[PDB]
Symmetry: D2
């Protein structure tokens, strides 16, 4: 239909999440989950921007207050997430990058959702103030057996919601569900997330490739060929621009926005790549697909891999459909016997 | 202890600049200047993070406060700097990347410093929330004639202070003056820059090379041979990892902290490089040399180039001394006559 | 029952409002309303604290941006409220202090709730930075006739929710519903309201009275007697302390917290007092009563007055039960024939 | 125009203080001091507003960062000031309301100024979110002996600068030095104090009297007669409205802006008044006289009292000159021998 009116639309994430839940006739359990996620992200954003740093540096002579050892944006971000999620009384299992084991939410606080997240992604290089972020994936528990590690082992095809929080020159939460991908910019003055982009679709063909070429020595012939074709185009066309931040969320977001292709392939050292399946690959692949792009491992789609370990790694190539395809053809070409 | 010089306490940019002024027995004109940059950076930072975006999206109606198409972060940032600077009564001429012509300060507000700045660097690419910055270089007006554009045409070697602010996961102002380089962390909560790194010195040798390889088709044989030797080390050592954000302040900063080399050479299809000399090359070079690195154009040193125009471009290479010298060797190996 | 556990309770207003709605099995219309109210308050808080003031004062040389005339925290606060409430698609009628007429929400955006509010209370004296606030009252529309001014004319006994936002040394939103009164402190860094007080009950007897004694000349004998008994106690006990800010929300909150009595009686100039019934008296009376206190006009309870005009005024006395009672007895004593 | 003196631009506290230092040909020691107060106020302001209260309430677990019973805004504020002050290398002795003894600065950080401050004024009453403040007075150490408590015992008349910060609906720093009074508005977004009111002068006569009438039973006949004449004007004029927050900085500030008179006289049950001389009475008096008001104890002028102890109390009356003189008349009318 055609909506005709005197309409002003200042749509916040909270209003959005609630309405969407109303439409779906959910019991509001997921609403509370998402609302809790939004609160965790904001708190992390604030910490990442170093609000309150003056105190570590004794502006008020740290009498003890925050205590002597480290509050590593790394672990702090973890605790903020697990804590905020458990208090939502909506998650039964949590799987985090920082935790060796899947955390089973106390019986008193259990829900029917499983969240796989990466508290602070790209953190290893925070010293140079590179854009870092949070990645999250949510599955609905598919059983009646006591929630165990096993419930997290579901292909990304089974995710009910997924997305990320980019703490770049500004903070953004990109949320993707069955209905589509939407971007929300955080107005830090009022602590609200404003819908700035609705139904985000990725360009069919982009003009930028993203890969850490320092590994060129260990790249497989399919990758080495694609890359060569990006720099020296055989139709004598314009070459692709290159750009690689070293932080997945930042690279993936740049791909979603301007289009192109991101790759973190298998190289001889990490035969199965470096990026972990459950909390990095899946979420980004799911986003990519709802956004209209492709996300493959080179042989198969990422969302269809059935995991066997929560910390399983997996190669990944994602981005505009025409580029991802163009590379996949090369894989088929060099695939033999 | 025989220390007339203490780091157990908390030192803000404002205390720091001021102490440095007392020591230098300045009349206090440069201090009002440095204090104005501090206020400028803080203001642009807040805008970059999107504080207040709610109003633009109609949280109170986009009547005449929102309206449209007028405020472009870059233009705002330009205005803030030019304005906060004139209001210091310390500048006589200002060269801006957003202004075709040099700006001569009204005789009332006229001072003695010449300031060259790039207000919002890397802001073509801001849509994908990439880290951006602001770059500045300050010369002492060395003349007696009515101030003019010519006062801005002094080789980088004559700078009295230079530096930049990086708006990334956090806001940081790196300031380099005659004595050395110092890094101040913005505590957004109190609007104060804290001293976290004193006398920053770059590594002799790093393990990261930064360049836009999308242009590999148009690099000179020296650059080409260099990149090659990094990926495929002849002495069988471990290859150099690659990283490229596409934002000067961000790459330069990564280079300063982790070491390595950043290059933006004379790429065919733009023979004089792309980065501008006065407000991009010179400041980063000044910082670099102050941190113990090198900043070469391939043939000569960046800071010694005599500008012929305020908007002049130049190719540039900077970073750890061992890496920058290594490429220089290759540069000699390939031509002269 | 007895809840026994490993429980951490970081209860935000959003989580609270949602859960309470879940219990009540509401369609979530009121949830969205309350969520929208929370967003309006935060935005007002931010503006009241003068965030961004540097721009009115040309820090970036107001090129036009916010435009030439006034953005009176007074009217701005109004627009923020009406706008945010209409966009919730949950209100059919709004009654504000700043508006002569009851605003009938567009058909496309109607809901079944009526909100009577005071955008910025105590605003007349903002110049001296006195604590100001927002007062709101919510009724459910009791009919099928097209929502008209008439739907706002319901005794305070009919309110479904009521409360206020105090922008004092910190911001607090006191929310009262059928189930009780709760206080939420705003952590401005993350823009969230934290439950800091649960089921707030007022002291039976307080030791502070609040009244503008400058009107002593026009006070009725009942008031004049009570006041005299507060200063010179006939049992030679300790006199009451006095305190009157001149801003209703600030006075009422101090009464709720420490206990005592607040009075804004009828004096010969305003035979029916100054405080308006629908958006000041009712809300505060409702809060007071759920909190365990009393709120009378001197003759009858405020919550039971059936209004005849939306801008009707009404005398008011509220506070601890023992004090309010002690004064009411005096009224009965001097009430004759 | 013949103005070597402009107000069309934006003036921050930092630019202001610094200009004032150049003019006064200061060595720059008092400027580092005033710059330290500025940083101090900003830090306490942020804390007062409760930025970060989430962590205390377990948003990331109250492990050891929260724990308990240690941080009391007043104690924190005390620490911040003492600490930020010592770190200026401009103070030799500090008198604090929270410290039984005067604090002598380590010879390393030792300067020449004596600072008397009340860190969190009106903070017994902070529970009800009443506006609070910080008061400061600065003397030049006029002696040669090893600095001691005695340097703080100088009559108010010897102050070089005095002022206060009010944490109310917004944060304001009012600063009064030899030339006059100036009001700086804190733009919390950029952490900068903006000059909004220059050369503040109080009204000759105002229409508001401020006093705690709960004590009317113990006022001397002069105060009693005065209050009476305000409520029941003998010349049949309109009565004086009353207002009393119970927070010095707040009442004093209301008095400065709207005019009128503030009184806290020698109330039986505390014969020397309640307000302390060094850090409450003297600063407000200094400001007052600088704004064109009067500050009397009833018999003598507050600023001329020679202190005998740093924690000495004194009765005080201040405000518009016509009102303060009027009570003084009544004070003469009632006694001498
Ligand atoms: N925005 C949303 N909020 C809540 N439920 C949603 C939302 N969008 C879709 N739904 C669906 O509602 C289902 C019911 O889950 P629940 O509320 O836990 O009983 C969810 O699992 C989702 O599939
Ligand atoms: N923080 C500082 N403030 C003022 N001048 C300084 C500072 N640090 C070093 N200087 C030197 O002192 C000279 C004095 O210049 P001016 O303040 O205008 O009188 C400057 O040009 C600098 O070379
Ligand atoms: N926190 C709350 N959120 C929503 N509904 C509530 C809440 N507390 C009580 N309820 C009741 O649920 C009723 C249903 O209204 P509605 O959701 O508009 O259909 C409301 O009018 C309230 O009486
Ligand atoms: N903003 C200012 N900074 C420094 N001194 C000032 C200022 N305004 C006035 N003065 C006067 O200058 C004297 C110089 O003291 P000092 O800075 O320590 O050398 C101070 O004691 C004041 O009386
Ligand atoms: O720069 P490299 O060595 O190619 O790997 C960095 C990658 O590792 C991660 O930190 C996590 O696996 C990603 O954010 C990032 O893309
Ligand atoms: O995409 P390109 O052409 O390689 O350019 C990015 C370069 O230009 C700039 O974006 C100029 O703003 C620099 O920050 C950066 O080094
Ligand atoms: O100080 P007065 O004259 O007694 O009246 C002030 C009253 O008016 C109001 O501004 C609104 O009616 C209240 O906030 C306040 O209590
Ligand atoms: O309630 P009282 O005894 O009248 O005192 C309030 C007075 O004491 C103080 O609260 C001291 O902090 C002052 O701010 C104020 O003027």
């Amino acid at each position: 239909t055609d909506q005709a009116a005197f309409d002003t639309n200042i749509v916040t994430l909270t209003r959005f999440v609630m309405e969407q839940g109303r439409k779906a006739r959910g019991t509001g359990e997921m609403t509370q989950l998402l609302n809790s996620l939004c609160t965790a992200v904001k708190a992390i954003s604030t910490a990442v921007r170093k609000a309150g740093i003056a105190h570590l540096y004794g502006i008020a002579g740290s009498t003890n207050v925050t205590g002597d050892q480290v509050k590593k944006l790394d672990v702090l971000s973890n605790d903020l997430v697990i804590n905020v999620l458990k208090s939502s009384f909506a998650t039964c299992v949590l799987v985090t990058e920082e935790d060796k084991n899947a955390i089973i939410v106390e019986p008193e606080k259990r829900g029917k959702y499983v969240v796989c997240f990466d508290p602070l992604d790209g953190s290893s290089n925070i010293d140079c103030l590179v854009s870092i972020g949070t990645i999250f994936g949510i599955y609905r528990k598919n059983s009646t057996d006591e929630p165990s590690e096993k419930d997290a082992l579901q292909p990304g095809r089974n995710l009910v919601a997924a997305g990320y929080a980019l703490y770049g020159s500004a903070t953004m939460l990109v949320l993707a569900m069955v209905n589509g991908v939407n971007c929300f910019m955080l107005d830090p003055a009022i602590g609200e997330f404003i819908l700035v982009d609705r139904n985000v679709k990725i360009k069919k063909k982009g003009s930028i490739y993203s890969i850490n070429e320092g590994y060129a020595k260990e790249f497989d012939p399919a990758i080495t060929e694609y890359i060569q074709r990006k720099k020296f185009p055989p139709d004598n066309s314009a070459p692709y621009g290159a750009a690689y931040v070293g932080s997945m969320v930042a690279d993936v977001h740049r791909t979603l926005v301007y289009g192109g292709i991101f790759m973190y392939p298998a190289n001889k050292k990490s035969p199965k790549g470096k990026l972990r399946l459950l909390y990095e690959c899946n979420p980004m692949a799911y986003v990519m697909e709802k956004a209209g792009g492709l996300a493959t491992t080179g042989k198969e789609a990422v969302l269809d891999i059935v995991p066997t370990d929560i910390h399983q790694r997996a190669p990944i190539i994602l981005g505009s459909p025409e580029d991802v395809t163009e590379l996949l053809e090369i894989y088929q070409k060099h695939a033999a016997k």
